[PDB]
Structure formats: C-alpha cells, structure tokens
Design an enzyme around this catalytic site. Structure first.
Site, PDB file in Angstrom:
ATOM      1  CE  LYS A  62      -4.363  -1.572   1.942  1.00  0.00           C
ATOM      2  NZ  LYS A  62      -4.240  -2.959   1.419  1.00  0.00           N
ATOM      3  CB  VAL A  93     -22.400   9.060  18.415  1.00  0.00           C
ATOM      4  CG1 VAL A  93     -23.263   9.343  19.653  1.00  0.00           C
ATOM      5  CG2 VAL A  93     -22.792   9.974  17.248  1.00  0.00           C
TER       6      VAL A  93
END
Length: 323
Positions: A62, A93
């Site tokens: 990568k 959240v």
DNA sequence: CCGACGACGCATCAGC
DNA sequence: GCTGATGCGG
DNA sequence: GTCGG
C-alpha cells in the site's frame, strides 16, 4: 515526514474497526502508523517501511501504491461509499459502536441530523454522546485540567478527608492537553478483603456543586460521566468534558495509579522488566513468581515507589514515563 | 500453518 | 423474574 | 494484518 502514509493507515484502521468489525486489523494498522510516525526519515519505498516491526507485506504494497500515485484505490472507493462512510462516521458518537452504527445505517439513519430525529431509538448513553458530540471531540488544555482537578480534590476532601484521589492519565505525566479526566479514588475503609456508597457519596457531591452534569454509567466501583467548569458569569461557557471516577481498594490503589498513569509503552516495559526479575504486575497487584512460574500472594504496596523497589528500578517520575 | 492480538464494569439484550 | 451474552468504552 | 511458535 510521512503524514500522508500515517493518515492513510489510520483511515484504513478506522474502517476495519467500525465497518468490517475487524478489531485486530484496526490495531495492526494503528501499530504500523505509530512505528512509521516515529521513523525519522521520509520513507522512499514499501521495502524500506517493511523493515520496521509491525509493517508487513500488505502495508508495504500500500505504501508503494501511495508513493507512486499519491492515493490508494481501496481507500478512495470506501470513502465515496455512502453506507460505509456513514457507518464509520456514526461511531464517533459515544455509545454508538460498530454494531449500533450498522443497525442505524441499515434502517436509513445516516447523519447526526437523523439521530436527532430518532431519539426513540437511542439509549441513554448514546443520547448523551449525541448531545455533546462536538464537545467530546475537543481536547482539554492543561490549565483547565488543573481547574477541574482543583474542584475534584476539594469536593472529595469535603465528603471525607480520609479519601485519597489522584487524577491520572497523561495529565499526571505533565501533558499539555488531555482527552478526558481519569480520577482514581480510595478510602482506608475499603480493602480487597473488607461500603457500597463510598463512590456514590463523591459522585453526589460533585453533582450537588454542579460540576458533574450527566451520568453515562455508575455502579459501586466505576462512574463514567460528563462535567463542565463553571462559566465566569459573562464569558463563553466551557465545553462539556468526559470524566471517569474509579473506586479501588486501598491495598490495590498504587498498582492502579501506576497502571492508569501509563504511558502504555512504559507499562509494557515495566512489566517486561518485572517478569525477568521474577514478578508479575497487573492493574491490581504485584505478585512473586516461583521457579516453576506459580504466582504467589500479592505483595504489600503502600506507594508507587514500593512497586519500583520490588523490581530493582529507580523511581521514575510520571513526567519520565513516556516509555 | 494457525492462534494471539487486554481485561473488565456497567447497561442492555437474548434466552429461559 | 433471573442468568448469561453482547456491546461499549477505557 | 503482522508476528512468531
């Protein structure tokens, strides 16, 4: 230096955790980004990065793609994916984890605005996490942590002057900012072999002087909630902050303080060293190990320094426990 | 090749 | 109702 | 995904 690489790896970590529900891949990408973030050269190839512990074949591939093209095809794709980007976002959240975020997105609940319209489907923790969404993502400057500590220590002493309370975390190591406040609490009457209102009394007093504003969870030994410094009559109010309070038996308290002071890398090293000296240290105790590896009874600990003495370490100031 | 990768308190759900 | 599992955060 | 027994 390598911020494009470590940003890439952090973003991949988040999707592993929050979308794929692959916690160990999350931690692999995080460990890779950390060791890269500490590397003091601008990385030129994946093979160069692969020589670092925690960077393997696939992350090396990568890095090669990112260095050649400036991006990563898989990351570009999942970024534009409405379902995956929404699941990833909703876990910001507090109280919404990967399972809740999945459920919400499955039924078309994708944004904070959608959550605000569906209070019915949120538990009490999630409602608090939504109410303070922006505040909880702000850091806490040390000067405010000092003002919070002032209040905590004063009110604790007012309940019972025999309580002992220590604000731990990176703050105790001298950090210029914190993510939350972690308070460790004990009382001489509470030992491992010994009242189910010791914690409650303290939480109640902080609520009565209006420092603690909300409760996420609360039992006989652990409180997780929300607090806020008093506003100065005319100035803008302070953000709401996350505070945890843990009650620990007196005979386990300094092992607790040592552990929750960290840092995480210091803890690893201290326990490594302790093992090679014939001791096992966890969050609660230090115990001797026999010659066949059987753990004996916990050893008396009346200070952090007792722990260092047992394992033949010079005392290390919290400021010096970065690693 | 294949298992480890932190353990646990509290809130809530699944099952009985 | 109680017991254990799961989700969650740290 | 990476490491290592």
């Amino acid at each position: 230096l390598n911020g494009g690489i470590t940003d890439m790896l952090t973003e991949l970590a988040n999707f592993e955790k929050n979308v794929s529900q692959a916690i160990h891949k999350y931690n692999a990408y995080r460990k890779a980004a950390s060791v890269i973030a500490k590397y003091p050269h601008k990385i030129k190839s994946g093979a160069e990065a692969k020589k670092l512990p925690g960077v393997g074949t696939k992350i090396a591939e990568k890095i090669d793609e990112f260095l050649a093209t400036g991006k990563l095809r898989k990351l570009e794709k999942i970024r534009q994916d409405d379902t995956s980007s929404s699941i990833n976002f909703l876990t910001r959240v507090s109280g919404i984890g990967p399972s809740a975020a999945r459920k919400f997105v499955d039924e078309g609940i994708k944004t904070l605005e959608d959550l605000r319209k569906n209070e019915d489907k949120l538990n009490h923790h999630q409602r608090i996490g939504l109410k303070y969404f922006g505040d909880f993502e702000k850091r806490i400057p040390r000067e405010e942590m000092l003002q919070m500590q002032d209040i905590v220590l004063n009110e604790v002493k007012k309940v019972d002057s025999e309580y002992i309370a220590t604000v731990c975390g990176s703050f105790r190591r001298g950090a210029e900012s914190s993510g939350d406040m972690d308070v460790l609490l004990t009382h001489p009457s509470f030992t491992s072999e010994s009242q189910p209102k010791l914690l409650h009394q303290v939480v109640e007093q902080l609520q009565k002087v209006h420092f603690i504003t909300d409760t996420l969870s609360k039992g006989e030994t652990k409180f997780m909630g929300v607090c806020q410094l008093p506003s100065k009559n005319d100035e803008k109010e302070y953000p709401h902050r996350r505070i945890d309070i843990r009650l620990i038996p007196k005979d386990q308290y300094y092992c607790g303080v040592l552990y929750f002071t960290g840092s995480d890398i210091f803890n690893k090293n201290m326990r490594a060293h302790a093992l090679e000296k014939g001791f096992t240290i966890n969050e609660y105790t230090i115990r001797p190990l026999g010659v066949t590896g059987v753990a004996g009874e916990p050893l008396p600990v009346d200070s952090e320094k007792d722990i260092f003495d047992y394992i033949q370490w010079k005392y290390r100031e919290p400021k010096d426990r970065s690693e």
